[PDB]
Enzyme design. Structure first.
Site, PDB file in Angstrom:
ATOM      1  N   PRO A  56       1.215  -1.121  -0.062  1.00 23.45           N
ATOM      2  CA  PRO A  56       0.144  -0.427   0.088  1.00 23.45           C
ATOM      3  C   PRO A  56       0.885   1.261   0.188  1.00 23.45           C
ATOM      4  CG  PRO A  56      -0.460  -0.713   2.286  1.00 23.45           C
ATOM      5  CD  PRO A  56       0.493  -2.162   0.741  1.00 23.45           C
ATOM      6  N   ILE A  66      -3.396  -3.522  -3.113  1.00 23.90           N
ATOM      7  CA  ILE A  66      -3.562  -4.501  -3.825  1.00 23.90           C
ATOM      8  C   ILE A  66      -5.372  -5.030  -2.505  1.00 23.90           C
ATOM      9  CG2 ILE A  66      -4.217  -7.380  -4.207  1.00 23.90           C
ATOM     10  CD1 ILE A  66      -0.611  -6.971  -4.053  1.00 23.90           C
ATOM     11  N   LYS A 114      -3.913  -3.746   6.925  1.00 20.43           N
ATOM     12  CA  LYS A 114      -2.674  -3.581   6.418  1.00 20.43           C
ATOM     13  C   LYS A 114      -1.551  -3.670   7.145  1.00 20.43           C
ATOM     14  CE  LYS A 114      -4.272  -5.140   2.124  1.00 20.43           C
ATOM     15  NZ  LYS A 114      -4.786  -4.181   0.119  1.00 20.43           N
TER      16      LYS A 114
END
Lengths: 114, 114, 114
Positions: free
Chosen positions: A1, A64, A32
């Site tokens: 990210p 993602i 995340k």
């Protein structure tokens, strides 16, 4: 990210603590680990918004997954909130783009994730 | 609608009037209000094109629609024309990318457009 | 084919020869003429990775084809290898994004390729 932000405000406001708070917030909103978060903020750029050189910014959050739909609304509110308090950029002069990346299209440590 | 341009030419050529003329032109070619246009031009970058460090540029125009197909041809001609007259970058050393963005994937003033 | 890289390391390490070696390598791994390759490296940026301001980088390779699938793995290994030897960025603090572009969505010399 990956979170990237360009602004015309002074680099004085872009402290290493700001980058940390952004990092923390990005990890939280994407759910995340912060160990994968990269933040890049660029200051004192030549930028106009609505034809004027008043304070403005353009950014992007690439990930993602975690970047599709009304989740982007909630995440925007938080990012806009943080960026203004620290950089004093009015919401109506900032864009943040949300970009979904395929696992096969980003490499970390020399290899893609899929 | 966001127009971003990176170049190795001197920041001397990137005047605040250039940014204004770009802004105006982007509004015109996308048929969108200039009140939503953001322009970012970055100068004196470390860049090569065709293996040489002669003047060159890479840019992108991101928009919800207005960036698909042979319309991109007409729009390119105008942008290349403006950038050369002001920055003296030969066409054969510049790229402009056209990027369609979904309404749910760009936030303005804290919220997505859809 | 466009390769862009942002890093927090000093511009001292970004030599004009580095840009040349990157250019050469990008031409090789995409199997495209170096005459079309553009390289942009940006140094001394305000960046964090994993919450720290230690050396890190984010890049992207954009191309019409040549950027899909396990080919991205092999290409990553080479790019990571070059960037570390020259910029001393550990693999576990760098991302490279691979972006497929449509022929109608990139203009060169005033016109799209399709």
């Amino acid at each position: 990210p990956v979170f990237q932000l360009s602004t015309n405000v002074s680099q004085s406001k872009v402290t290493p603590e700001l980058l940390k708070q952004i990092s923390s917030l990005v990890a939280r909103i994407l759910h995340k680990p912060e160990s994968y978060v990269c933040v890049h903020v660029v200051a004192d750029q030549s930028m106009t918004f609505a034809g004027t050189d008043d304070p403005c910014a353009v950014g992007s959050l690439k990930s993602i997954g975690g970047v599709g739909g009304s989740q982007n609304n909630s995440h925007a509110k938080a990012l806009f909130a943080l960026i203004k308090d620290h950089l004093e950029i009015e919401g109506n002069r900032m864009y943040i783009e949300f970009v979904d990346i395929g696992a096969g299209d980003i490499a970390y440590n020399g290899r893609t994730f899929a």
